[PDB]
Design a binder for this molecule. Structure first.
Ligand SMILES: N[C@H](Cc1ccccc1)C(=O)N1CCC[C@H]1C(=O)NCc1ccncc1
Ligand SMILES: *[C@@H]1O[C@H](CO)[C@@H](O)[C@H](O)[C@H]1NC(C)=O
Ligand code: NA
Ligand code: NA
Lengths: 251, 11, 28
């Protein structure tokens, strides 16, 4: 996260770290959506241009974390993966359309002060909150700059951007399964996701029921925190029918 | 970099 | 889950985090 700040303790208790076993390193962010299911970006697991194709046994999920590198004894919980599910129409060839994946844990994780699931939006909450100017919050342990790495989880709040501005900022083909967020050059403030933040959540706190909803997944961007560029996020609600299909079939 | 995690999670 | 999106150290104890107000102010 570029131009963010240190998270407060328990600020993002749905935050998940995807952790590579060997070599032991941060792979991606992710989010906890129930005691047995974790949501992330497909490109965190499958991206053939970079020879990335992880299997369940390659990875661990670390939940309840704050420090990036520490083993947070008596706080974090480490889970093994039972199964990975990637969206069947994930477009790794072109533009990361439908950049979404689910991971089922081998065993349920115990909730605590530091571990708690985020809500997924309904049609109404998405329609109400996914509006240009409305801010969400992005969290992760990714790079602090485009070209180092944080001690603890970082957070930044960013406004959703009008679709034509998103489209005009890039040569990549944008789809309805994406939205973009970030400040404009004239808006002064800044901030962005960066490499390592992939798969983490873009969340909004509903002013109607005071619950946090995951509206987006950190997907892609051209550089980090560049003027006139914006971060792109998987549109969770647009892909919710797939999420529900997978959980209903395999849950 | 990363602190070693308990071996139970790598077995 | 019925309890999703309510943080033990914040909403569950009626404490606010340092920047959630910025989000609320944007929801015009
Ligand atoms: N920079 C590429 C742009 C791109 C987008 C879509 C298809 C191909 C290439 C990118 O973000 N990529 C290439 C594959 C993964 C993704 C990435 O690094 N995503 C993390 C990220 C998030 C926000 N800002 C910067 C990077
Ligand atoms: C990724 O890995 C799986 C299994 O190892 C393989 O069958 C698949 O063809 C690979 N490439 C994909 C899914 O694009
Ligand atoms: Na364009
Ligand atoms: Na920017």
């Amino acid at each position: 996260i570029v131009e963010g700040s240190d998270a407060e303790i328990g600020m993002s208790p749905w935050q998940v770290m995807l952790f590579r076993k060997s070599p032991q390193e941060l792979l991606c962010g992710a989010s906890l959506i129930s005691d047995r299911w974790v949501l992330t970006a497909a490109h965190c697991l499958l991206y053939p241009p970079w020879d990335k194709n992880f299997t369940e046994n390659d990875l661990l999920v670390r939940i309840g974390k704050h420090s990036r590198t520490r083993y947070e004894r008596n706080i974090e919980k480490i889970s093994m993966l039972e199964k990975i599910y990637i969206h069947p129409r994930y477009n790794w060839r072109e533009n990361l359309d439908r950049d979404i994946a689910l991971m089922k844990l081998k065993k349920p994780v115990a909730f605590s002060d530091y571990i708690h699931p985020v809500c997924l939006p309904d049609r109404e909450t998405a329609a109400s909150l996914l509006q240009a100017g409305y801010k969400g919050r992005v969290t992760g342990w990714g790079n602090l700059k485009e070209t180092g790495q944080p001690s603890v989880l970082q957070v930044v709040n960013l406004p959703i951007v009008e679709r034509p501005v998103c489209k005009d900022s890039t040569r990549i083909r944008i789809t309805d399964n994406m939205f973009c967020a970030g400040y404009k050059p004239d808006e002064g403030k800044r901030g962005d996701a960066c490499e390592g933040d992939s798969g983490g959540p873009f969340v909004m706190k509903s002013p109607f029921n005071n619950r946090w909803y995951q509206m987006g997944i950190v997907s892609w961007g051209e550089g980090c925190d560049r003027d006139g560029k914006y971060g792109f996020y998987t549109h969770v609600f647009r892909l919710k029918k797939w999420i529900q299909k997978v959980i209903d079939q395999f849950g | 970099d990363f602190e070693e995690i308990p071996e139970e999670y790598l077995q | 889950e019925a309890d999703c999106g309510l943080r033990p150290l914040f909403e569950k104890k009626s404490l606010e985090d340092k920047t959630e107000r910025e989000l609320l102010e944007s929801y015009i």
